[PDB]
Amino acid sequence: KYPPSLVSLIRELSRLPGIGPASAQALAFHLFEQPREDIERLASALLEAKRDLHVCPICFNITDAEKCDVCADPSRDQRTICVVEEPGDVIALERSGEYRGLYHVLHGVLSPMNGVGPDKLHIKPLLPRVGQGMEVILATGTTVEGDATALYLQRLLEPLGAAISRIAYGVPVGGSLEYTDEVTLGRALTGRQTVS
Amino acid sequence: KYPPSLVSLIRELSRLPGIGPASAQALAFHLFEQPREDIERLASALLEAKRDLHVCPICFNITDAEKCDVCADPSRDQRTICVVEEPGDVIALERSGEYRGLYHVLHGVLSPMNGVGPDKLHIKPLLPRVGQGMEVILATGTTVEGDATALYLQRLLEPLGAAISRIAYGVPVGGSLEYTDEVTLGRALTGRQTVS
Amino acid sequence: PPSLVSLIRELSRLPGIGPASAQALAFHLFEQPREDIERLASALLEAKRDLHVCPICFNITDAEKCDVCADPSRDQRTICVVEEPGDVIALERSGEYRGLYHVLHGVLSPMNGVGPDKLHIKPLLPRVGQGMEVILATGTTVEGDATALYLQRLLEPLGAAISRIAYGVPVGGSLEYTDEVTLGRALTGRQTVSKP
Amino acid sequence: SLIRELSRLPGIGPASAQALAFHLFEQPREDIERLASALLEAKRDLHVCPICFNITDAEKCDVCADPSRDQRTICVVEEPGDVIALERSGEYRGLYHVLHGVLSPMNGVGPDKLHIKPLLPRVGQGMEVILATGTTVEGDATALYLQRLLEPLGAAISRIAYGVPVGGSLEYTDEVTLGRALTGRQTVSKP
Amino acid sequence: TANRSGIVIRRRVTPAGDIIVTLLTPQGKLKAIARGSSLNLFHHVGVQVYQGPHNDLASVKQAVLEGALPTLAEPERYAFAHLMAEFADALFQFSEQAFDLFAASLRGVAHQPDPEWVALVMSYKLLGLAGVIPQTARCARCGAPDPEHPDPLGGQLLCSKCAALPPYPPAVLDFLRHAVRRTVRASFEQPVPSADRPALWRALEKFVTVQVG
Amino acid sequence: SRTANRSGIVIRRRVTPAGDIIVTLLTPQGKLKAIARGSSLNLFHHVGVQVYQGPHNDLASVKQAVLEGALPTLAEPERYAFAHLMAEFADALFQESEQAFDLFAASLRGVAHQPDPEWVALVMSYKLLGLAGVIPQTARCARCGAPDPEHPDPLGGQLLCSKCAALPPYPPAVLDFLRHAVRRTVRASFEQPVPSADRPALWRALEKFVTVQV
Ligand SMILES: [Zn+2]
Ligand SMILES: [Zn+2]
Ligand SMILES: [Zn+2]
Ligand SMILES: [Zn+2]
Ligand SMILES: [Zn+2]
Ligand SMILES: [Zn+2]
Structure with a gap:
């Protein structure tokens, strides 16, 4: 028996990832009790994001600019490129503070079943970026379709000069063997680095 | 280190109840990957909600109309009014299908501590609606400020004619005593109905 | 290990214990002294033999009567029937009851095979006498509900007063997030306050 | 008595103890009996193993005595569970040695209570030792120390790889692990 | 999921x-x-x-x-429900029809004023849709048409020449016979007199006991 | 909330x-x-x-x-023992001013990076003690009160005079540090390390001092 407007707002809210229809309702109700400033501003912020910020031409990471801060930035080496599934993934690797290279962001992981070939990911323009005497670190997720995408990219990239690497599969920080999954364990065990 | 737009959008997102700053970021990133249709529509839905739907003059329930569907609706008896803290609370009681009366939505409880007197709640216009030979069921939560609010309303309403009731405090359905809180137990125990 | 299989499976036995929960416990157990483990089984079997069911109301004790019965400071006006021993405890906790409990030891289920025989009903009837009060503290599951209903329509011939612990919304909970059944029943069960 | 003795064990809170004691009162003399029975059979009948300190009954665990397993390599794990979940992966036919803790100075744990010393005999010329202690700084350190102590004897020291676990996305993986799986990265195509 | x-x-x-x-x-x-x-x-x-x-x-x-x-x-409708659901659990292991039926059963055992009647009728329909039909036309021992005697061993019907116990009363027989044909609608309109139901109960009990586990 | x-x-x-x-x-x-x-x-x-x-x-x-x-x-083994120490201090002092936090913080930083970890641990050790209001007493002998005691004190963890002392004097480096110990800045107190050879005395020193207070 809901006001039409309400049902719209709720639906749109429910479209967002993470919002259960329940949550979407609660969220709309609360959205109501708020002033018109509050709203006109939220909606404004959205529209201004839609309009302003876009995808960098070099690595397809987000920016309002003509080149993502990371590409433009001079302290960084074009000697290496880290290929990664999504922008959040750049943020996450960057927080680690442990990587000074460049990035490439696909925005997808090959899924045939979901209809996703590399006509969909940003795989094509990666190619002219690689050449003789560079590294390409392959940073897709440990998910099957990630791993797969990694593989496909190794094979695609082989012809052109660069070295090719895969971020280590293994056990994360502050884990115990007791409480880690057989698969991961196996990988870590085989993939062990030797020292002496 | 994000384009300014991004930070805005993220902030606004975080303002929403339930959105952890983390969640707000994830939420904006994903918001990005969606088409412009998707967005302009979400924002549109918001603004159209802010504009269209308002508070019902009789009971301050939500509607886009001049009277909430519940007030306008003829099958219902003005003999009774259920006073209830928030709109969601109406929805909730109505689902129960157990109630044919009218409603009143205060839109919050009494919190002196948070600076909330019955100049903030919609207490004043409830008054002309009560009179001789009606029931007022007091539907505020079992929270202290709910209880409190109920009490205040009993005393306020005493002078005019109507009967006054309080929704039963006690144990919910399919509960076990073993696993219910001492307070609730106590209430149920004292508040027991006698039959034979 | 043949007997570690014993220990650990014998752990998987108890409720709350899954396979790796059993593991965890068996292993952690291997690191206790002979002392701990010993006195552990000791307390275990002292609990087996030394204490037993009580005939009067079937709350667990050691001696010939539970401290609810034998202890004279408690009033004989009222008896309170609960589903099981835990119910007795959590009920004492609320600090609202100085009377008698009688323990049925289970609810009425025909499917599951439970007749009011294995149930301690029959031994209850002697305890109810002219002009007392009996309160029905069986749980609120349809099974406990029915159990009560039966207990009343059976108990009404003897002169005492039958009351049953209140169904309602539990202390400190808001309607919006309370279920339709409980709401409905706290809507109907509602007490009155102010009458013309 | 019973119930407090329940609150004793880990995983058991006060009303968890209640629930269990009570549910226990409704078992037979049989159940409860054989329960304590298995309890004390577990006490006496089985003990620590002197070679590598995995729990068993007989004079050796089935990892040691059983000749089908290779002696080339020994794998050091924090505790028995580690042994199990490690066998599970189906990736290892060799030896485990169990150091019955990790190294913590604060907590007071020195490599004495730890089964380090009894490890040294087992490592011979030209073997491999893999370090399966956990990845907590304490397990980390433990390993580090185990290597810098173990390098004099001729065997080969390797340590289980740090990185992002199977089936997980970076976005939601922590900065420390990411960084270490970024550095630890293996190479595939070289020119 | x-x-x-x-x-x-x-x-x-x-x-x-x-x-x-x-x-x-x-x-x-x-x-x-x-x-x-x-x-x-x-x-x-x-x-x-x-x-x-x-x-x-x-x-x-x-x-x-x-x-x-x-x-x-409430005690009546209660015993009767638990039963109906015990049926739903024994048969129906598979067509939605059974669900809409047993559904209707709970509805009618809840509201309809004569709960025991609902339980009998819906009982034999629940059995029936589930492909267990009281066999009536032929004696269980000798095969003689129109047996009217309760059979203990098989839960079917024995003829006078093949029966130790007396005949199910005419009401219970008429129902038994035309039992599985009639609609809920018009099978509610023809209830067994209270006095004769206990026979018909004790009847259904052995029938089910002998087929169903 | x-x-x-x-x-x-x-x-x-x-x-x-x-x-x-x-x-x-x-x-x-x-x-x-x-x-x-x-x-x-x-x-x-x-x-x-x-x-x-x-x-x-x-x-x-x-x-x-x-x-x-x-x-x-x-x-890595070195920086390890030293950390566990520093944190054991943070736990024994600072009883649940932010200063202590920024300090012990700095301690872990320097015990991690700085190339002479044992030195970091000595210095920061006595600063951690100090900010926490435990100061090695130097100028006055612990027993008789004689100025400029140069000898170990087994019982109190303070300094005794050659006359009231069983053991020989802490070497000049260890003494100079001990005395001017809590006054200098981390900056300029890192520039004046006790020779490796003389630290063990200074360790054995700090150990009983702490044992006896803390
Ligand atoms: Zn870029
Ligand atoms: Zn209205
Ligand atoms: Zn008793
Ligand atoms: Zn062994
Ligand atoms: Zn016959
Ligand atoms: Zn002196």
């Missing part, structure tokens, strides 16, 4: 606080476990449940109540 | 076989010991988290733990 619509035809607990439960859905019976609608016996519910090799008894994530029948606790 | 979120460093970590992890944090708001059942919350992490407090549970619960920074190097 799938979500479905159901009715709880069985309920159980292990002291851990975990509740194992049997549902009847139009997709057949489904037995799911939930650790922790509060999921009550005879509720008409709907829920999300999670399946896999991880756990071989289906877990339960979100349980939401659609409809419910409180009346079923 | 009874639910607060704060910034911290884990100066203590523990487990009960259930899989529950009790933990001690050092925050600028003082030390705080919170429990969580299940940053993976690692020793020496610089972390931040939401924790819930009340009468319901008298040891603070933990809801969301998030890592800010971390120092891996601290595992």
Whole structure:
């Protein structure tokens, strides 16, 4: 028996990832009790994001600019490129503070079943970026379709000069063997680095 | 280190109840990957909600109309009014299908501590609606400020004619005593109905 | 290990214990002294033999009567029937009851095979006498509900007063997030306050 | 008595103890009996193993005595569970040695209570030792120390790889692990 | 992970606080476990449940109540429900029809003023749709037409020449015979007199005992 | 509300076989010991988290733990023993001013990076003690009161005079440090290290001093 407007707002809210229809309702109700400033501003912020910020031409990471801060930035080496599934993934690797290279962001992981070939990911323009005497670190997720995408990219990239690497599969920080999954364990065990 | 737009959008997102700053970021990133249709529509839905739907003059329930569907609706008896803290609370009681009366939505409880007197709640216009030979069921939560609010309303309403009731405090359905809180137990125990 | 299989499976036995929960416990157990483990089984079997069911109301004790019965400071006006021993405890906790409990030891289920025989009903009837009060503290599951209903329509011939612990919304909970059944029943069960 | 003795064990809170004691009162003399029975059979009948300190009954665990397993390599794990979940992966036919803790100075744990010393005999010329202690700084350190102590004897020291676990996305993986799986990265195509 | 619509035809607990439960859905019976609608016996519910090799008894994530029948606790309607659901659990292992039927059963045993009657009728229809038909026309021993004697061993009907006990009264016979043909509508209109039901009860009991486990 | 979120460093970590992890944090708001059942919350992490407090549970619960920074190097044997020390101080002093937090913080930083870890641990050791109001007493003999005592004191962990002293004098380097010890800045107190050869005396020194106070 809901006001039409309400049902719209709720639906749109429910479209967002993470919002259960329940949550979407609660969220709309609360959205109501708020002033018109509050709203006109939220909606404004959205529209201004839609309009302003876009995808960098070099690595397809987000920016309002003509080149993502990371590409433009001079302290960084074009000697290496880290290929990664999504922008959040750049943020996450960057927080680690442990990587000074460049990035490439696909925005997808090959899924045939979901209809996703590399006509969909940003795989094509990666190619002219690689050449003789560079590294390409392959940073897709440990998910099957990630791993797969990694593989496909190794094979695609082989012809052109660069070295090719895969971020280590293994056990994360502050884990115990007791409480880690057989698969991961196996990988870590085989993939062990030797020292002496 | 994000384009300014991004930070805005993220902030606004975080303002929403339930959105952890983390969640707000994830939420904006994903918001990005969606088409412009998707967005302009979400924002549109918001603004159209802010504009269209308002508070019902009789009971301050939500509607886009001049009277909430519940007030306008003829099958219902003005003999009774259920006073209830928030709109969601109406929805909730109505689902129960157990109630044919009218409603009143205060839109919050009494919190002196948070600076909330019955100049903030919609207490004043409830008054002309009560009179001789009606029931007022007091539907505020079992929270202290709910209880409190109920009490205040009993005393306020005493002078005019109507009967006054309080929704039963006690144990919910399919509960076990073993696993219910001492307070609730106590209430149920004292508040027991006698039959034979 | 043949007997570690014993220990650990014998752990998987108890409720709350899954396979790796059993593991965890068996292993952690291997690191206790002979002392701990010993006195552990000791307390275990002292609990087996030394204490037993009580005939009067079937709350667990050691001696010939539970401290609810034998202890004279408690009033004989009222008896309170609960589903099981835990119910007795959590009920004492609320600090609202100085009377008698009688323990049925289970609810009425025909499917599951439970007749009011294995149930301690029959031994209850002697305890109810002219002009007392009996309160029905069986749980609120349809099974406990029915159990009560039966207990009343059976108990009404003897002169005492039958009351049953209140169904309602539990202390400190808001309607919006309370279920339709409980709401409905706290809507109907509602007490009155102010009458013309 | 019973119930407090329940609150004793880990995983058991006060009303968890209640629930269990009570549910226990409704078992037979049989159940409860054989329960304590298995309890004390577990006490006496089985003990620590002197070679590598995995729990068993007989004079050796089935990892040691059983000749089908290779002696080339020994794998050091924090505790028995580690042994199990490690066998599970189906990736290892060799030896485990169990150091019955990790190294913590604060907590007071020195490599004495730890089964380090009894490890040294087992490592011979030209073997491999893999370090399966956990990845907590304490397990980390433990390993580090185990290597810098173990390098004099001729065997080969390797340590289980740090990185992002199977089936997980970076976005939601922590900065420390990411960084270490970024550095630890293996190479595939070289020119 | 799938979500479905159901009715709880069985309920159980292990002291851990975990509740194992049997549902009847139009997709057949489904037995799911939930650790922790509060999921009550005879509720008409709907829920999300999670399946896999991880756990071989289906877990339960979100349980939401659609409809419910409180009346079923009052002693009469109660015994009768528990029965109906015990049927739903024994047959129906698979066509949605059984679900809409047993459904109707609970409805009618809840509201209709003569609950025992509902229970008899719906009892034989529940059995029937499930392909267990009282065999009437032919004596169970000799094969003689139109037997009117209760048979103890098989739960079928014996002729006078092949029967130790006296004949089921005419009401109970008429029902027994034309039992599985009539519609709920017009089979409610022709109830066995109260005085003759106990025979017809004791009848149905052995019949079921001998077929169903 | 009874639910607060704060910034911290884990100066203590523990487990009960259930899989529950009790933990001690050092925050600028003082030390705080919170429990969580299940940053993976690692020793020496610089972390931040939401924790819930009340009468319901008298040891603070933990809801969301998030890592800010971390120092891996601290595992390698040297820097390790030294860390565990520094944190044991942070736990014994600073009884749950932010100053102590920024200090011990700095300690872990320098014991991780700086090339002479044992020196970091001495200096920061006595600064950690000092800010916490425990000062080695030097100018006056512990027994007789004679100025400029140069000898070890077994009983009090202070300094005795050659006349009231059983053991020989702490070497000049160790003395000079001991005396001018708590006055100098970390900056310029790192520039004046005790020779390796003379540290052990200075260690054995600090050990009894602490044992006897703390
Ligand atoms: Zn770029
Ligand atoms: Zn209205
Ligand atoms: Zn008793
Ligand atoms: Zn062994
Ligand atoms: Zn015959
Ligand atoms: Zn002196």
